[PDB]
Amino acid sequence: GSVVGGLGGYMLGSAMSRPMIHFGNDWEDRYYRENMYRYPNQVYYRPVDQASNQNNFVHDCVNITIKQHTVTTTTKGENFTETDVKMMERVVEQMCVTQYQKESQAYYDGRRSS
């Protein structure tokens, strides 16, 4: 367990796949594809209890995942730029939305409204 930045019951998705994102600036697209190793291929989230709908779930995901690779590096000799973060926000959102869907089903299969 940890509670490093709130994580005292949070969870960590196994290694995922990098999604595709198309901001449509001809620097923004390359900026993702070129820098991608700098971004965590795993997302942190909380367990899917009572509600955990994607709104508060993606909120807590992007909050904590950024916190535990940006707030815990930007002091340690990284210095994650806002432009680099702008990419991480979506990259974490996407991968969090994937993980959200996984545990959503696992929750759902007990909450069934058919």
CATH number of 1-114, picked from 3.50.50.60, 1.50.10.10, 1.10.790.10, 1.20.1440.230: 1.10.790.10
Contact between 35 and 87 (Cβ < 8 Å): yes
Contact between 46 and 104 (Cβ < 8 Å): no
Q: Which two tokens stand for residue 49?
A: 């209890």
Torsion of CA 53, 102, 7, 79, to 10 degrees: -100
Contact between 88 and 32 (Cβ < 8 Å): no
Contact between 37 and 4 (Cβ < 8 Å): no
Solving technique: NMR
- Give the residue carrying structure tokens 């508060």: 56
Cα 75 from chain centroid (whole Å):
20
